């Protein structure tokens, strides 16, 4: 184990947020029009936050071309795509020239162990009824127990 494995020429440096932002915007855009993502979902807010964390003046121009020329007449998922995309554009514009932020909007989950009638143990990380977001997480962490 004490064998040195570090080498400066095996380092993998990742910088190109500008490409991945434009990739993810259009990935979510076609997920919307094909029925794979609606606005109520919580991972949609996560990845929209990850898009507005990578917003560049060229990224809003990328978004606006695909939202202006999104054809509303092809279906209702195209209406949803235009409304959600326009809202994300309006958010990225005001997040523009501001500071990228780590905001975890994950749905808080707690442990539940249950034994099925056949005798199997299943541990499920179930969504909490009383704590749905980290704002309530912090509140109930300050509550003690």
């Amino acid at each position: 184990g004490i064998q040195p494995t570090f080498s400066a020429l095996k380092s993998r440096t990742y910088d190109s947020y500008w490409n991945w932002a434009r990739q993810d915007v259009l990935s979510m855009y076609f997920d919307i029009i094909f029925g794979k993502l609606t606005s109520v979902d919580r991972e949609t807010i996560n990845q929209c936050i990850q898009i507005m964390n990578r917003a560049n003046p060229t990224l809003i121009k990328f978004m606006q071309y695909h939202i202006d020329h999104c054809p509303e007449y092809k279906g209702e998922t195209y209406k949803l795509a235009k409304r959600l995309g326009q809202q994300l554009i309006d958010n990225c514009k005001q997040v523009l020239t501001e500071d990228p932020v780590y905001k975890d909007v994950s749905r808080i989950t707690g442990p539940k162990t249950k034994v099925s009638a056949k005798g199997n143990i299943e541990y499920e990380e179930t969504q909490k009824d009383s704590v749905r977001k980290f704002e309530q997480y912090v509140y109930e962490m300050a509550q003690g127990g």
Binding site: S39, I45, C48, L84, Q87, L88, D90, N91, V95, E98
Partner: peptide
């Protein structure tokens, strides 16, 4: 919900 700096009055 999507539409950023919220102020706090009750920490």
């Amino acid at each position: 919900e999507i539409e950023d700096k919220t102020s706090i009055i009750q920490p």
